[PDB]
Design a binder for these strands. Structure first.
Ligand code: NAD
Lengths: 442, 341, 49, 142, 208, 97, 175, 47, 93
RNA sequence: AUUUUACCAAUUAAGAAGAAUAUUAUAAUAAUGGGUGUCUUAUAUUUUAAAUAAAUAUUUAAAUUCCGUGUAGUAAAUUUAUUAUUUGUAUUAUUUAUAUAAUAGGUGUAUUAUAUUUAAAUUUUAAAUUUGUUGUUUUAUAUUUAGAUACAUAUUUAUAGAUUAAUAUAUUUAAAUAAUAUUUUAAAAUUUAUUGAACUGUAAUGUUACAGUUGUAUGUACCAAAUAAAUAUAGUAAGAUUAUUUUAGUUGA
RNA sequence: AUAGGGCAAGUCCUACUCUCCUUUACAAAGAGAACAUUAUAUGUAAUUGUAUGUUUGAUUGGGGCAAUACUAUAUUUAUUUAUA
């Protein structure tokens, strides 16, 4: 009810049976008494380390800007970042170093985390943008169909004259006023809305959510997420060994499979993907935080038989990382391959965001060593990207004797001479007196 | 319309009028340790006399202030029991009056007795002890004991830093700007400001004590002492402001939604309280005796049942049909193996 | 006073609700008269005659 | 309605996605001819010629010096009415500035800039605005 | 409600009829200056989008445009100093908005430019060429990827030839051709040949 | 409807006009007209300044500039185009004239 | 439109027959009753009650020989601030006290003098300093305050005005 | 606002000061004619 | 670009009203927003839950997901009380 | 011997599969008119025609014109495709029934004005209509239910003038590129297609023939007929329109 | 008997309009005759019908504007215009 309404207190007795239970009801001894659940802050989810333990070196105290390591401690073989780190606006300006676990639940080494990804301080407005987009997008628009006056299936004829009978003037009573009738403007799937998300906002919100998980200490870096066998018993055994609570009421785990440090992959590991199909709350997501630029070909009602909501026709796939899933699942697990892919796909965006007086310095400090120009040995890439690059290298040979050489286009663009034919009203190329231009067909 | 207030007007109730409970020093600490590191009486009339004495103090009529404080102290001594807050406070005022008049020895004796009474008492007021330390420092400075006055000021500073809450003053005054619903006019409510110097007298007392300590250091010629005391004063003001800070909600005019006032004015935690008792540093005690779901290793500490048996994982598809159920026969066995031991 | 002088050309300066009741009564009377007239013209029974 | 109704038991009709209106439907040629908008974005006014818009007999008006060519702003009431007719396209979005009386380069090019049109090479960069392409040496229509 | 502001959904509808009227949803005295109206964008009209010389100089200073190369609309688009919204035919016109000097020579190829901007460029020592183009030429310049061979470029229309392409003041790129005489002298000399003034395989071999 | 107001005394109940110290509608119109006329006369106390070309409204500035364009490009004093849209003659001498 | 549906259905049990049986009739009757009671309370109840009190006081005055008119005027003249409710209560439960009040009003006892205006003591005009001590005006004000303190009640501070005024010397310490 | 307030004050003063005007026959206000003070048949005592 | 409407979230299915949005999904015609509210005075059923909007993680016999209440299925054994303990459907006396 | 005044009171816990191979949308793979209690006989069981149609189209320019009724190949057989009882109750969401009934043996008064018990006082519909604001007008037995749509908000990749009738000119400051919607009930309506002569009105000798730009007052118990389809300038008819405890300007210009 | 149970209605005079009638004019049918080209048509179609829709808002008027500026000269003038 409303606090100010009299109904809020119109009941004055009978709420409690004055006789207490003999099982758990107790008394308040005094301030020295520690009451369960009591806490000075309004915690709607009053959890502690025992309920939902955090996987991080330190409990996230306000004294620490983040629970993870701030320096590369010498006890472990610290690994740097795949790409150089530049602190953009919104980054924590602090060094993020986290320990990497193995399938045995024991740390093997430590890894640097990019501030632009796990160091972008969260903001509630952006997180809420992401959450609202996901909530609106994850509805079953096909089930939002309702009948209409023209669909009620009643005779199209005045049921009786205006004044002759003695009842209200009603003709063709298909209207909402009647129980069998419909609505003038009912809800239809093609009338509903599917919001259009921007790649920039989506990436920013996803990185803010990742940083929020990192701050809360729910983040865990794992070397590999492979199973001995593709069954579910092996997956449950791995969860038990790693102390992952995938029960429906345990906290949940989100998995960015990706790949290992040496062999990042965009495709889920076969065995783990097969074995991760378990009833309990446990979600598997792609190793990407970006999203394909959403579009809407039917931006106007040009296709009248479009049985889909107005708006973007390319909504984010369900398995994509999102704020809703990140909040619902307690722990987050990210593989070295996932980190590699995230850094690889966000490096260009970070550099473009950087201002110009730092952009110009980038190459000076060596953050723009392009493998294509031979400045450096080619960088590490996922299995699929490396295969595609090898295919390109192998196929580059055939573009040698043809004028349409993509690698060396317009080779004779300088030695040729350009002439203007007034009679033809055109401009043409000539090499050694031979017309090289092409009279475009029409 | 416009109001002239030519006739009596009842002051409007506002959240800034909350009766703030004064900070009190803990019962397990000793002011002496820190240093060494009812009969009927017309209290209304004696309060009139005390107010008149305060006015004389402000007006510079120190002899008259001392004369009034003499009667007030006599009355309080007769009325209240020994080692009482009112008695020590009136003795502080009397010591200040003596110091201003010129009876430095009398002022020193009175403030020393005040400190003795504070040590003897239990849970003394933080503001009261800070004011007593300030008065002792001023008296020592007047006597010429600059070093001891500075020591007293520093002691007051450390006492307030270690036993003062810097956000409690504006706990209920921090979300007031959110009450405002109009932007074109009556927008002073969206920027309503309450001065910490007025809503936290301990802060003002310590600020004055640190200013006097800085002046004494400058007079002596010391540099490190002045730097540290000024920096501590700056940090104190920074703490107060930080506790006062907040973002802006709705900016432009809002029509209706007057029931949002309940949300706007609440026990909103202050920044200092939030940082102190964050959910992780100040963990929540969760007794599984009164809870159903418990961690994997402590599955046996759940709310006891008369005689309970596990049926399945509650798979909603079980209701559907033979094939749907057949597609989940081993789920319960696998879950049991997962939760084994 | 008239009902809506701006719409007198449409509703005769009388509320349609009052006009609705008046026309209901008059139409009841007219329907009864028409049924009687049909019976008279067809031989005491409208459908049958 | 209720489940046990023949009205919904039988299938009368089904409605499609209702077609939308032309985006520049309320940009009227009468305005585009009579008036023209000019001035700063937040202080722009619509102006029209000033004079006697009437046809006399042959010998009535003789001194052309009386008739002079000049522009004067239309009445603010009519300007507000026309700007409203331009605004009504998108009413929820208060941030969207009113549509211009005459289309400009940015407005013409935004549609082609969109992704779906970004792929359409035949409609990009003022294809219709540009003059016609030269036809082929031999061209027949039969 | 129109005459009463925001009213609660509860009731009090009796005093509101304009609200329902709006829910259910002088030019005649002014003359027509022309058949198409004032500022009519008839087909073939040269309506250039502005390109602030100050904006171009700012881009150069920041570093999005390389001074060492002859700037073109394609280079501007790739550097992202202009958006696709403002690329309509005929293209851009250079305007010297608030610019008094150009410290360094700049070589640009736009579809039009102001006299002041051309003077500033020439005084600074750079060069400007009014490369007036048709739709095909503009599209080819913006998307050279799609044309592996130099497709025959049709010359602009008569309006373009008169105004921009063959205008010495605008530095029209066809001024030399228009001024030539042999093309009028004989069909053989109708066209005069012009020439520029005088690998790319990303994979390399690792060497230690 | 009538704007109801929270009362502070029965005098507000007896009150009919919310602002008794405010002139009625006709007197408001009279006072506003007098104030506007006085302000206009104060503005026009000085003569009609002949503003330059650049200061003309948007619908005269460009016409004047186009009319005098040739003289701007070929500089010689004594060139004035007698345009029609320019400011009208006041009829009396002024300080700015 | 809001009506006190839930609030009034609760007390709908206080009506009879059709109103108590049918929700709509009972709610309408209760709404009407509440509105009429509100109007009566805000515009006639006080008048009726104070008229009754007036009549009771008048009857007491008549029994004692006076009447409400003269009694009210003489109470005003004598400055006895007894509200009419208090006068009725005294007449009904303390007839002797009411008769004493009537006798006071009847008697030619001089009514209390009007309140005095603040008087500036000659000490304010006395120069200070003449050409460690206290201003004579301040000393006089302190003496008046101490006298008020002592006269407010039988406090144990003592009746010695001079001793109280010399209190600060008790806390003073001789150098 | 200053001009409007001044005009309102002037209007109030003009409409509230000249309560009554001398009869036009005795002296025409519109013709600038004014009537002086005739104290012949007057008295000095405070009656 | 435009933030996704917060009313389009499936957190509320209000009864059709005078004020709304073309994309605001209101309750169907002839249907009530709150399932248990057959009458304005009806009480919320105790221990009976009607899962709505998603497939439940854990479904009890006493609850409803997409069927109606029948004693022989919702209450197999009356003397037994089902509940969720340690993420399992556990039944006690 | 005889006998207990008159009047006044109230709705709630539900006994049992008397609710599911259910209701709606959803499948882009079938398809010669589905017809069981059917069950020879084919002179007698034939529907075809270059057109906006069970095939349904990504933008604001210019442009005919007395309210501009308006936008092109995007890939060339390229995956926007008219789907479909189960190899998941198909999946996902959504919706859902009024069969059923001890309830009390007397708180207020007893010569008449209306709930709160100290006696009194107060009290005697609501909504819309009526702008000459009513005593005009219309609706409401009651219980429960059904019943009506203008997005209250734009975080780094990012870049946005004008101006002439026209040529032309362009000395010279912004910006969160987003579109799809727009109460509800009701017009004497008109339009398309179709049937009716068992009533009635004629001709023929009960039956036959003639029918809605129409046959002979009427054409099957409302003749501007009947049946089927439709949401016309619903506007310059009218009615209805779901969210109390509120927080700022003018009351006849 | 009163209220309820549809009712600004009745007569009378004036004014305007509708229905209706008619023809020589207006629009407009359909149909047809005739004509051009060589028993079926195409292209025009001034007759007729008048079935049908109209047939008392005239500011789509009147006035005022009248090359020969500027400095200057001469003539004439219905008693101060006129012309170069
Ligand atoms: N014609 C246009 O309007 C137009 C428009 C945009 C782009 N282009 C590009 O111009 C070039 C020629 O166009 P056109 O109209 O003069 O001839 P065209 O488009 O009719 O091509 C005809 C033949 O050329 C082949 N061809 C085209 N590109 C080829 C390539 N890289 N390598 C090998 N074969 C190729 C085609 O397979 C086809 O068989 C094309 O590459 C096209 O992408 C042309």
């Amino acid at each position: 009810s409303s606090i100010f309404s009299p109904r809020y207190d119109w009941r004055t007795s009978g709420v409690h049976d004055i006789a207490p239970r003999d099982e758990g009801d107790f008394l308040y001894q005094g301030p020295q008494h520690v009451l369960p659940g009591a806490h000075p802050l309004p915690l709607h989810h009053p959890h502690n380390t025992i309920t939902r333990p955090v996987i991080s070196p330190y409990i996230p105290s306000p004294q620490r800007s983040h629970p993870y390591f701030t320096a590369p401690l010498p006890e472990l073989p610290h690994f740097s970042t795949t790409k150089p780190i530049v602190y953009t606006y919104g980054t924590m300006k602090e060094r993020i170093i986290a320990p990497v676990f193995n399938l045995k639940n024991e740390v093997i080494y430590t890894r640097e985390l990019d501030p632009f990804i796990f160091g972008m301080y969260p903001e509630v407005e952006e997180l809420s943008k992401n959450l609202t987009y996901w909530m609106v997008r994850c509805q079953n628009f096909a089930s939002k169909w309702d009948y209409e006056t023209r669909e009620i299936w009643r005779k199209a004829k005045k049921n009786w004259p205006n004044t002759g009978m003695g009842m209200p003037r009603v003709g063709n009573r298909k209207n909402h006023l009647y129980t069998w009738g419909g609505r003038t403007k009912p809800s239809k799937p093609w009338n509903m809305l599917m919001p259009t998300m921007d790649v920039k906002t989506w990436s920013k919100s996803n990185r803010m959510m990742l940083t929020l998980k990192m701050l809360q200490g729910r983040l865990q870096v794992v070397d590999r997420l492979t199973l001995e066998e593709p069954t579910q018993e092996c997956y449950l055994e791995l969860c038990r060994n790693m102390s992952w609570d995938v029960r429906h009421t345990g906290g949940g785990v989100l998995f960015m499979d990706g790949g290992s440090r040496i062999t990042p992959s965009s495709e889920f590991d076969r065995a783990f993907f097969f074995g991760s199909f378990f009833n309990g709350r446990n979600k598997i997501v792609r190793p990407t935080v970006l999203c394909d630029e959403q579009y809407d070909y039917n931006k106007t009602a040009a296709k009248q038989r479009m049985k889909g909501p107005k708006g973007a026709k390319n909504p984010i796939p369900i398995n994509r990382f999102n704020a809703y899933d990140a909040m619902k699942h307690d722990r987050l697990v990210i593989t070295e391959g996932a980190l590699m892919q995230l850094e690889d796909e966000l490096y260009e965006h970070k550099l473009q965001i950087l201002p110009p007086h730092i952009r110009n310095q980038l190459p000076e400090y060596g953050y723009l060593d392009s493998e294509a120009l031979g400045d450096c040995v080619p960088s590490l890439k996922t299995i699929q990207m490396e295969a595609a690059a090898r295919t390109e290298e192998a196929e580059s040979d055939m573009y040698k004797s043809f004028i349409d050489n993509p690698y060396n286009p317009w080779k004779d663009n300088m030695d040729a001479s350009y002439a203007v034919d007034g009679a033809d009203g055109t401009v043409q190329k000539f090499v050694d007196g031979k017309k090289v231009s092409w009279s475009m067909l029409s | 319309v416009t109001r002239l207030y030519t006739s009596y007007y009842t002051g409007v109730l506002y959240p800034n009028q909350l009766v703030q409970p004064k900070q009190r020093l803990p019962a397990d600490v000793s002011v002496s340790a820190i240093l060494q590191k009812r009969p009927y009486v017309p209290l209304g009339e004696v309060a009139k006399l005390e107010l008149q004495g305060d006015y004389y103090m402000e007006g510079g009529m120190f002899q008259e202030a001392l004369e009034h404080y003499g009667v007030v102290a006599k009355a309080y001594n007769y009325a209240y029991p020994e080692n009482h807050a009112q008695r020590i406070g009136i003795r502080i005022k009397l010591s200040a009056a003596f110091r201003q008049t010129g009876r430095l020895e009398s002022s020193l004796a009175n403030i020393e007795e005040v400190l003795r009474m504070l040590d003897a008492s239990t849970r003394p007021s933080l503001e009261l002890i800070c004011e007593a330390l300030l008065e002792l420092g001023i008296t020592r400075e007047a006597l010429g004991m600059k070093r001891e006055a500075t020591e007293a000021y520093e002691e007051a500073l450390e006492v307030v830093n270690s036993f003062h809450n810097w956000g409690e003053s504006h706990r209920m005054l921090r979300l007031l700007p959110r009450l405002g619903r109009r932007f074109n006019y009556n927008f002073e409510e969206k920027f309503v400001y309450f001065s910490p110097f007025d809503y936290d007298r301990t802060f003002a007392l310590v600020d004055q004590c640190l200013e006097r300590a800085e002046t004494i250091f400058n007079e002596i010629g010391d540099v490190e002492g002045a730097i540290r005391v000024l920096q501590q004063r700056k940090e104190m003001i920074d703490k107060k402001f930080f506790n006062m800070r907040d973002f802006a909600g709705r900016i432009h005019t809002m029509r209706g939604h007057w029931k949002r006032r309940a949300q706007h004015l609440t026990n909103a935690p202050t920044p200092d309280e939030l940082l102190r008792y964050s959910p992780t540093i100040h963990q929540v005690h969760r007794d599984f005796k009164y809870e159903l779901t418990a961690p994997i290793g402590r599955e046996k500490e759940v709310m006891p049942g008369v005689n309970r048996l596990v049926l399945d994982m509650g798979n909603p598809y079980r209701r559907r049909g033979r094939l749907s159920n057949k597609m989940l026969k081993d789920a319960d066995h696998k879950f049991a193996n997962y939760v084994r031991q | 006073p008239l009902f809506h002088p701006q719409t007198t050309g449409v509703h005769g300066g009388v509320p349609p609700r009052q006009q609705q009741r008046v026309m209901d009564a008059i139409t009841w009377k007219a329907v009864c008269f028409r049924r009687g007239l049909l019976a008279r013209r067809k031989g005491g029974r409208a459908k049958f005659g | 309605p209720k489940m046990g109704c023949e009205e919904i038991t039988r299938k009368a009709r089904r409605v499609q996605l209702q077609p939308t209106e032309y985006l520049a439907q309320h940009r009227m040629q009468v305005w585009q001819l009579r008036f023209k908008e000019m001035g700063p974005p937040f202080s722009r006014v619509w102006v029209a010629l000033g004079g006697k818009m009437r046809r006399r007999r042959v010998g009535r008006q003789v001194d052309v010096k009386d008739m002079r060519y000049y522009w004067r702003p239309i009445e603010p009431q009519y300007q507000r009415l026309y700007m409203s007719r331009l605004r009504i396209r998108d009413h929820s979005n208060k941030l969207r500035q009113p549509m211009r009386l005459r289309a400009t380069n940015a407005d013409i090019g935004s549609g082609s800039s969109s992704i779906e049109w970004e792929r359409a090479s035949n409609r990009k960069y003022g294809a219709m605005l540009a003059p016609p392409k030269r036809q082929d040496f031999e061209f027949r229509v039969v | 409600m129109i005459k009463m502001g925001w009213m609660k959904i509860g009731g009090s509808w009796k005093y509101s009829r304009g609200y329902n009227d709006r829910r259910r949803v002088r030019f005649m005295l002014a003359p027509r200056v022309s058949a198409g109206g004032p500022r009519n964008r008839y087909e073939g009209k040269l309506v250039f989008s502005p390109l602030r010389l100050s904006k171009l100089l700012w881009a150069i200073d920041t570093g999005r445009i390389n001074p060492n190369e002859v700037i073109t609309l394609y280079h501007l688009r790739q550097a992202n100093v202009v958006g696709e919204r403002e690329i309509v035919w005929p293209g851009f016109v250079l305007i010297s908005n608030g610019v008094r000097r150009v410290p360094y020579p700049i070589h640009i190829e736009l579809q039009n430019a102001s006299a002041e901007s051309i003077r500033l460029i020439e005084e600074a020592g750079g060069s400007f060429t009014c490369v007036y183009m048709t739709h095909e030429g503009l599209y080819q310049e913006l998307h050279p990827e799609e044309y592996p061979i130099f497709m025959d470029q049709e010359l602009p229309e008569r309006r373009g030839l008169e105004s921009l392409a063959t205008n010495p003041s605008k530095r029209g790129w066809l001024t030399r051709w228009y001024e030539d005489s042999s093309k009028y002298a004989h069909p053989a000399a109708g066209r005069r040949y012009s020439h520029y003034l005088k690998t790319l395989l990303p994979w390399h071999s690792y060497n230690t | 409807l009538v704007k109801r107001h929270k009362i502070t005394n029965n005098q507000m109940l007896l009150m009919r006009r919310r602002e008794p110290y405010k002139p009625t509608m006709k007197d408001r119109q009279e006072i506003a007209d007098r104030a506007k006329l006085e302000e206009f006369e104060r503005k026009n106390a000085d003569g009609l300044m002949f503003v330059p070309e650049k200061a003309l409204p948007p619908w005269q500035k460009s016409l004047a500039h186009n009319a005098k364009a040739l003289g701007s490009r070929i500089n010689f004093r004594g060139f004035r185009v007698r345009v029609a849209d320019g400011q009208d003659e006041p009829g009396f001498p002024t300080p700015f004239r | 439109h809001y009506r006190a549906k839930l609030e009034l259905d609760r007390i709908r049990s206080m009506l009879r027959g059709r109103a108590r049986l049918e929700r709509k009739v009972g709610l309408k009757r209760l709404f009407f009753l509440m509105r009429t009671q509100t109007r009566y309370r805000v515009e006639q109840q006080a008048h009726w009650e104070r008229a009754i009190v007036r009549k009771n006081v008048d009857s007491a005055a008549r029994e004692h020989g006076t009447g409400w008119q003269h009694l009210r005027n003489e109470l005003g003249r004598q400055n006895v601030m007894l509200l009419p409710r208090s006068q009725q209560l005294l007449a009904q439960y303390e007839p002797l006290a009411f008769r004493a009040v009537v006798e006071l009003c009847a008697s030619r006892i001089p009514p209390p003098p009007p309140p005095v205006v603040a008087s500036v003591p000659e000490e304010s005009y006395t120069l200070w300093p003449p050409a460690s001590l206290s201003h004579p005006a301040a000393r006089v004000e302190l003496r008046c305050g101490v006298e008020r303190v002592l006269r407010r009640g039988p406090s144990g501070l003592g009746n010695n005005v001079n001793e109280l005024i010399d209190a600060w010397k008790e806390f003073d310490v001789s150098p | 606002a200053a001009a409007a307030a001044a005009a309102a004050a002037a209007a109030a003063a003009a409409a509230a000061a000249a309560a009554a005007a001398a009869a036009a026959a005795a002296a025409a206000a519109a013709a600038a004619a004014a009537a002086a003070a005739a104290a012949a048949a007057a008295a000095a005592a405070a009656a | 670009p435009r933030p996704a409407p917060r009313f389009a979230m499936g957190h509320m299915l209000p009864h059709r009203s005078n004020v709304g949005s073309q994309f605001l999904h209101t309750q169907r015609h002839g249907s009530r927003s709150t399932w248990y509210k057959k009458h304005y005075f009806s009480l919320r059923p105790f221990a009976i839950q009607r899962h709505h909007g998603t497939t439940p993680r854990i479904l009890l016999d006493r609850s409803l997901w997409k069927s109606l209440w029948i004693t022989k299925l919702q209450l197999p054994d009356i003397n037994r009380w089902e509940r969720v303990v340690n993420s399992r459907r556990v039944t006690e006396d």
